[PDB]
Amino acid sequence: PMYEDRVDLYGADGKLLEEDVPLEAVSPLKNPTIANLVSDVKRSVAVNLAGIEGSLRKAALGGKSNFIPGREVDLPIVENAEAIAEKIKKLVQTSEDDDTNIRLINNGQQILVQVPTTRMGVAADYTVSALVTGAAVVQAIIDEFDVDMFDANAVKTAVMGRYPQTVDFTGANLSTLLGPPVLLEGLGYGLRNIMANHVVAITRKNTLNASALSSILEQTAMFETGDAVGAFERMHLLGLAYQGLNANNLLFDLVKENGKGTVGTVIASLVERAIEDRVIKVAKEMTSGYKMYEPADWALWNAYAATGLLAATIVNVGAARAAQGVASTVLYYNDILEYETGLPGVDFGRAMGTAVGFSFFSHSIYGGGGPGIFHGNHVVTRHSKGFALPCVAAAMCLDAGTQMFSVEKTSGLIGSVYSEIDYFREPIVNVAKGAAEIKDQL
Amino acid sequence: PMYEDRVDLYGADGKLLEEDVPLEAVSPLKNPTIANLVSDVKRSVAVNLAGIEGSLRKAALGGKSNFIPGREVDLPIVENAEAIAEKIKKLVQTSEDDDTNIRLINNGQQILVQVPTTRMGVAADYTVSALVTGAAVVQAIIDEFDVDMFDANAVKTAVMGRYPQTVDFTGANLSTLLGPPVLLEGLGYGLRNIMANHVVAITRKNTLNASALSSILEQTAMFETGDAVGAFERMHLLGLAYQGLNANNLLFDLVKENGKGTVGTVIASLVERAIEDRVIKVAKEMTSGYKMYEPADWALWNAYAATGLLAATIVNVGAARAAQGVASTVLYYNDILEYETGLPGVDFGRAMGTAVGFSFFSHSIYGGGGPGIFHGNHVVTRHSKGFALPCVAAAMCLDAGTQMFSVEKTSGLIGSVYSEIDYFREPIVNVAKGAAEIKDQL
Amino acid sequence: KKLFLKALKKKFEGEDPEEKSTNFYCFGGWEQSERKREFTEYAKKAAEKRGGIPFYNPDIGVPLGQRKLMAYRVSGTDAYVEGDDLHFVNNAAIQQMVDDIKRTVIVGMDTAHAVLEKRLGVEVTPETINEYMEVINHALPGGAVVQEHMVEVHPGIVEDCYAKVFTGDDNLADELDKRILIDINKEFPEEQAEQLKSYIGNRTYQVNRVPTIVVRACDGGTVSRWSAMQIGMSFISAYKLCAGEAAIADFSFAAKHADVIEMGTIMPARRARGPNEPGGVAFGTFADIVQASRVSDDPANVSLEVIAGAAALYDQVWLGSYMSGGVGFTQYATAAYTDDILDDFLYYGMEYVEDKFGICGSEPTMDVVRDISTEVTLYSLEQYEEYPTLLEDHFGGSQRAAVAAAAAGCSTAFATGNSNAGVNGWYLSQILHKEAHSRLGFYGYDLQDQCGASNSLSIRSDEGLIHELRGPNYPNYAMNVGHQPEYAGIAQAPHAARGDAFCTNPLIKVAFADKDLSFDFTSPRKSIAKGALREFIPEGERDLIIPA
Amino acid sequence: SYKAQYTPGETRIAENRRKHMNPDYELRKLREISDEDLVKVLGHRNPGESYKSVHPPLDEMDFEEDIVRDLVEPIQGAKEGVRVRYIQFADSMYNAPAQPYDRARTYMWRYRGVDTGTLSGRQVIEMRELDLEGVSKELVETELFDPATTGIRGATVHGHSLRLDENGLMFDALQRYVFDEETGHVVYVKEQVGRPLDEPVDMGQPLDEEELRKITTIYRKDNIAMRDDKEAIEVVENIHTGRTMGGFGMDVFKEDLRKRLGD
Ligand code: F43
Ligand SMILES: C[C@@H](OP(=O)(O)O)[C@H](NC(=O)CCCCCCS)C(=O)O
Ligand SMILES: C[C@@H](OP(=O)(O)O)[C@H](NC(=O)CCCCCCS)C(=O)O
Ligand SMILES: O=S(=O)(O)CCS
């Protein structure tokens, strides 16, 4: 292969999945599970039929506390969800043999619509899924009940919200994991737009699968932004493999041996492991006896450091079962690590800097919110190139109910709509199976 | 197939290409040529090596008339274009066997970079191609000349402009046919963002290939926005086939028989043809003898009407060999057609309405410009759902040199960079060959 | 009697309103006008300040005033003013109308109160809400509440800054300090009060008006932030919290995102603006901001008051400056609120509807839209044909097209109760007008009218949208004068005919039912008139911090 | 074969519109103007000066075969690369014999290589200047022009909607034409942007009111009301209804939808 690195892939239960795997087998550019996961995130649309119906019944149209008296339309949409879904299927598909998927959820109150890849292939960006799904839902409803021409625009408004007066689907009754590109902070940030509470809901609160899904999306986004190009590619792959996918069981063993420990003891365990594995070495011993270290392999040191970072998050937030401590943990893990060793911390300071602002904007009057609402497209937590947000996913799995903006409050139907998708819910085991499929092709 | 319609596909020379083709054989969802054209538009990036070099030499960084004295970097980039291109290839590709394409143009002063579909597949939107290409160019240059750490950020700024202080690549020395999605007017508008003058340069000023390329991109965008879904799909396919692709030679024959005629005589020829083909019929004869018509087939009437509109543009702008008249032509072709017949004009008024604003914003103080700078993502000319911009592409092919913002001024290198792509330059014949490839699979 | 005749008779004194001929070139040019003379005189007095730079000069370009330069009656008032006094730069009332909208945000209090009780174990009572409202009325205008060595904003320049609370819970309303209460039962007629409360429920909201000087120095995007910062400080102080703990971030997210109601939404990049700017105000949002609905049960009067405010907002300020600038678009807008001309046409249409269908007496059908729009358009055109002075008054085709179609569209909405049937009627009126006079408006006036019939009842992507929620960013509407103000009237019309308390949002409607606003939103006509007369005292001037 | 209809309507006003639009209807000449005087009032060039180009002769612009391009005959001004110039009219709403959309529709039926703009207060044609001068002569000499109610004006065009002056002429803030009281003729003393003419151009006598009521293309209650042309209104409503139905889509495209639904 291109790189010489090989790793063992271990599951979230700390047991070996795949032995002696070339690093590139988990590259977003090669792994077939990652490709399918990204395709599904882009093409999937949640249709809230119960919300469309109730919006229409009250003329509760176009967002928070809007009502248009006199424009109510009373239709039995949920009772006819099966017929409406069959119509949506006919309108969205490109052929009977394609990969269009329509699934009713929650007694027909919601639909998961997965738009065929043929439509994505001839579209410029991923908004096509929402747009095509919205058009099919509007026409399916109008046709199902023969909605008259003067009422039809209310159906349109119930489905897509205030668009096009708003730049997006404000107050709509459909949603996607990715928001429209007009709201992106950075070019190429589409995959970073999923709030941590949604990640937790998709993985049903399982700590390491949440942090894995976050790492997969973040690092795949780093390929999209051009950050994981050339000189930097190996750093991002090693980051994914170690911090996201529990390579060589390092993440799991660090937590296990520090289950009654602190952020400091996790640092000591990680530095010791890095010395044994010859990832770092002593550069100079100072007058006091202090040993200043240097990396022997900079991308691999960063990966070891990032793995200790996630382990420290799990130990310290796991001890509190309160997610607020996550920003502080990310901050002082890096701070202590640097002054313990003389080495650069995770992402060469950017994970620590991200945590400084994240701390401030989760404890102050100025903006932000609780940890669960942050994501890689948020101005506060965009700065680390994939190494910080997996900690927030892990932290919110471990919160036992201390948040006002909890998973239930922000993400209440996200589990029922998306978590039955195996690669979403259980990314580690399925990425490992993908790695096994291609390991001999690299 | 789904639809019963069949057409004969004729070339820009008015001669038969394919007989008895199912309508869906030219669908953006089915035709393999359209899929490949759209893929190439999304993945292609123009790298201006000469511009990067001169920008560095003068510290002319970050947009027009910027200079940063003292920060000049003097490098023989164009002299080493081959070596640099070979490095870009290694950085952009995902494997030696993939569809990465790097072509030096204009003695190495520009590079056409086509990013591999594998990278597009795991990215959320089409900006990946610019971002990855920019990252590869920056590293290739820094590595080729061992640019020192304090000068390196100037190379970055020379390639990508003022990003990220600007939301886009302001003042950059790379470009794409599609701008970044944060500048889209409407959701799904990515494919509509190509100015008419660029279309004219890509097709080397060949009238009907320009109008075809514009129609293909516009109508493919209507699939992306969800407008060509369900009830409306057939209207958009017939529009593409007749107005964009000279179905049944109707476009060509209308121009030919009116080469010494007027917008009015084109209308008379089109209405007569529509009566002959039983596309419209008399609904009521009025006291004065005036016959009010109705469509027998609404989507087909619209397609006939749209074809006459393009023919009228070619006749009336072609008579003047001056593109300014295009907006007036689109306006009054529709206005006269409606009062000649009682029928709705092209796109049920929206082509006419587009033309009113387009006339205004190409003759007033308030905005706009000459016809060559408009496109479907422009606030002025977004309103017709694919039926108006092909006229502007045709018109600028016919301009003999009356514009300040001419092709040469706005699009001076666009031909040398992109026009060698056969599908871009000659879309009609190649779409027909794609249709022949799949006609019996439908 | 025609409602515009009184104005014509004063505007064309000494002349028969029906006479087709007159004399021109006999007025002395610009010297016929008090205002033009004043302007020229100030231009000369400016010479020293400008140090030689040329300036306003009536001898540059067009010699204005070869015809008689008109005065205008502000409709529904007895104020007669020159057109220049209605230019938004010259009229402090118009500027304060916009500033009062830009500087208002509404924030739900129930989430913050849940954070206090559920997360912080702190009890919320009427007494603690009252104490909080007292604190935020010191903090919101720039007073310090926690830190030592704070500098503060001069209270003398922010006396217009304040916060109030309202609630759908009558039991809580009876317990809140009335100095800071917007009392729904006192501001609204009984039936409207009952309707508002059924939609608002047992929810509580604070209405924050940040200082006028702040939105003038900065922008509309400042407002939700400024409100949220001081809401946070006021919870910390009033409830005695640790001044910087995790729960505080919940108040922030609630006040800036989860529980905030802004007046306007953001623009796409080509016309980029933050929230609470005019392009982001939906037509139904503006109709709810205007307060004529709660003091008048005349649906024509209510719609006409909305159109007057919206002409100032959308045509004069938004399109005429934000999107263009210069001399701008005063008379494109004044045609819809002067000389009682639009009044005459709309009262004709309302009376035609009352007689033939009844107000709200028809379901929406194309037959009804065609009947009403055609009849009111013909009546309107005939008025310009019977009165040469009327046609010389509304001298620009755009003016005439907007006013005839406004009467047609509102009347159609009166009959059918459906705003989109109204706007379909507006599009019929425009193409009939065009075919009658063989002209319509300016070069690019009917872009949206030729696309309008098809998009009025469309259900597609960027075409379909219920009319109340369309606004200046609806794509067809994003460029041109002579439509947006009247569309606001069409959004109001079916709701005024029904007697609804609001068009789109009961929180917006209550939030402007407040005598302590500076601009009088119960009658935008009367306030604009007071500005035209130089009798309106705006907010935000800087006299206290600059030399005498 | 096909017989053009031009416009609906049962009244004299509609037939006047149809006559203007019909290329086989010969417009009556009411006056004559010399070539020199027409060029002088246009104001773009002096007579006798060579036509000025904006680009080289057309046969140097055609580098590549374009079969569709060569289907269309270029007008002579295009062949020669002559610059584009304009004429602009205001038409009084007191029954001027031509009116703004009437003009646009007439031009697009009768003339080749037209760029025409319609506004309430003026109507402009921009054309290769060589061909503009031929077209303009017809627009000034025929019943499309009345010197009292049709004003030639490229700037400061106010007046279409104003009362007529005491001599029956339309307002012109720049007074590009004046009434000669000695003769009763309307005389141009300025060209269409307002520069003074060295030599005034006589445009002859105004049409009388009764002739204007007979040949005008505007509807007015005091002459023939729009309300009276039930046929024209019926067709306008039909266009409106058809556009509404097409935008709504679901009924006119019902069979297209049924094929998409697999029904
Ligand atoms: C409530 C917060 C948490 C928050 O989000 N912002 C606060 C308060 C906010 C308020 C204080 C206004 C008031 O008193 O009503 C304002 C003025 C912003 C606003 N809403 O207008 C502000 N801080 Ni603060 N804030 C400041 C600062 C600071 C310094 C003060 C340190 C000290 O020893 O006094 C500390 C942070 C630190 O320790 O480094 C600080 C904290 C804090 N800052 C603590 C309150 C601390 C306390 O209880 O005393 N600010 C500064 O370090 C100087 C500038 C000063 C700002 C006002 C100005 O620039 O004039 C003010 C900037
Ligand atoms: C973080 C973000 O706030 P939100 O999390 O979006 O509410 C952003 N504010 C800020 O960056 C506040 C910056 C100024 C006050 C703190 C200065 S240290 C904003 O309002 O757009
Ligand atoms: C068209 C567009 O201008 P540009 O073509 O982008 O220069 C747009 N202007 C407008 O829409 C001006 C509208 C107000 C002036 C005309 C009113 S009829 C704008 O500035 O963003
Ligand atoms: O003359 S235009 O119609 O172009 C602008 C009028 S304000």
Q: With H, G, I as helix, E, B as strand and everything else as coil, classify residue D11.
A: coil
In whole angstroms, what is the distance from residue C9 CA to residue C12 CA?
5
3-state secondary structure B326-375: HHHHHHHHHHHHHHHHCCCCHHHHHHHHHHHHHHHCCCCCCCCCCHHHCC
CA dihedral D188, D191, D196, D197 (to 10 degrees): -70
Annotation marks residue C445 as catalytic: no
Instruction: Find chain C residues with C-beta within 8 A of A362's C-beta.
Output: 246, 249
H helix runs in C176-298, sequence order: 184-187, 190-200, 212-217, 221-238, 246-253, 283-289
Nearest-atom index, ligand 3, CA of C480:
18
Do the strands A110-114 and C162-167 form a parallel or antiparallel pair, or are they unpaired? unpaired
In whole angstroms, what is the distance from residue A153 CA to residue D205 CA?
57
Q: Name residues whose C-beta falls within 8 Å of residue D30's C-beta, 6 or more positions apart in sequence.
A: D141, D142, D143, D145, D204, D207
CB-based contact A316:A305 (threshold 8 Å): no
Annotation marks residue C331 as catalytic: no
Find the largest Cα–Cα distance for chain A. Answer: 86
H or E stretch at A223: helix A207-224
In whole angstroms, what is the distance from residue B254 CA to residue B263 CA?
11
* Residue C54 token pair: 């040329």
In whole angstroms, what is the distance from residue B322 CA to residue B330 CA?
14
Q: Which amino acid is at B147?
A: V
Q: Which residue is listed with tokens 């006003």?
A: D13
Q: With H, G, I as helix, E, B as strand and everything else as coil, classify residue D90.
A: strand
Nearest-Cα distance to chain C for A288, in Å, is: 39
* CA angle A328–A332–A338, rounded 5-degree value: 160
Q: Identify the DSSP state of B247.
A: B
What domains are defined for chain C? 1-101 (3.90.390.10), 102-276 (3.30.70.470), 277-505 (1.20.840.10)
Q: How remote is the CA of residue C236 from the centroid of ligand 1, in Å?
A: 12
In whole angstroms, what is the distance from residue C497 CA to residue C412 CA?
11
Nearest-atom index, ligand 4, CA of B364:
4
Give the residue among B263, D2, B385, B276 at the shortest CA–CA distance from B254.
Answer: B263
Q: Which amino acid is at B29?
A: L
Nearest-Cα distance to chain A for D247, in Å, is: 10
Which phi and psi angles does B20 have, rounded to 5°? 60, 60
3-state secondary structure A110-136: EEEEECCHHHHHCCCCCHHHHHHHHHH
Q: Name residues whose C-beta falls within 8 Å of residue A168's C-beta, 6 or more positions apart in sequence.
A: A161, A179, A180, A182, A183, B187
* Residue C398 token pair: 């755009």
H or E stretch at B430: helix B427-438
Q: Which residue is listed with tokens 């000319």?
A: B381
Establish if D164 touches chain C: CB-CB under 8 angstroms: yes
Interface A-D, measured as beta-carbon pairs within 8 A, has a size of: 18
In whole angstroms, what is the distance from residue D176 CA to residue A417 CA?
74
Instruction: Find chain D residues with C-beta within 8 A of B398's C-beta.
Output: 69, 72
Give the residue among A341, A335, A221 at the shortest CA–CA distance from A279.
Answer: A341
Find the largest Cα–Cα distance for chain C. Answer: 82
Instruction: Find chain D residues with C-beta within 8 A of A152's C-beta.
Output: 248, 250
Distances (CA, A) of A260 to A43, A256, A266, A306, A320: 43, 9, 10, 21, 12
H or E stretch at D125: strand D123-128
In whole angstroms, what is the distance from residue C485 CA to residue D64 CA?
52
Q: With H, G, I as helix, E, B as strand and everything else as coil, classify residue D114.
A: coil
CB-based contact B72:B86 (threshold 8 Å): no
Residues of B with catalytic roles: 366
What is the count of structural domains for chain D?
1
Beta strands in A398-439 (DSSP E): none
Solving technique for this entry? X-ray
Annotation marks residue C14 as catalytic: no
Q: Of the candidates C444, C449, C460, which has its C-beta nearest B359's C-beta?
A: C444
Structural domain range at position D222: 1-263
CB-based contact B127:B70 (threshold 8 Å): no
Instruction: Find chain D residues with C-beta within 8 A of C389's C-beta.
Output: 163
Distance of CA A314 to the CA centre of its chain: 18
Instruction: Inspect the interface and report whether the beta carbons of B361 and C444 lie closer than 8 Å.
Output: yes
Q: Whose CA is nearest to atom 20 of ligand 2?
A: A367
In angstroms, the first-to-last Cα distance of chain B is: 5
Confirm or reject: Cβ of B368 under 6 Å from ligand 3. yes
In whole angstroms, what is the distance from residue B291 CA to residue B282 CA?
6
- Resolution in angstroms comes to 1.8
Establish if D227 touches chain B: CB-CB under 8 angstroms: no
Establish if C202 touches chain B: CB-CB under 8 angstroms: no
Q: Name residues whose C-beta falls within 8 Å of residue C249's C-beta, 6 or more positions apart in sequence.
A: A361, A362, A363, A364, A368, A369, A370
What domains are defined for chain A? 1-43+191-442 (1.20.840.10), 44-190 (3.30.70.470)
Establish if C458 touches chain D: CB-CB under 8 angstroms: yes
3-state secondary structure D178-207: EECCCCCCEEEEECCCCCEEEEEEECCCCC
Q: Which CATH number covers residue D243?
A: 3.90.320.20
Annotation marks residue C480 as catalytic: yes
DSSP string, A7-70: EEEE-TTS-EEEEEEEGGGG-TTT-HHHHHHHHHHHHEEEEEHHHHHHHHHHT--SSTT---TT
Q: From its phi and psi, is residue B342 left (phi > 0), alpha (psi between -120 and 50) or beta?
A: left
Establish if D219 touches chain C: CB-CB under 8 angstroms: yes
Instruction: Inspect the interface and report whether the beta carbons of B350 and C442 lie closer than 8 Å.
Output: no
Nearest-Cα distance to chain D for B337, in Å, is: 9
Q: With H, G, I as helix, E, B as strand and everything else as coil, classify residue A262.
A: coil
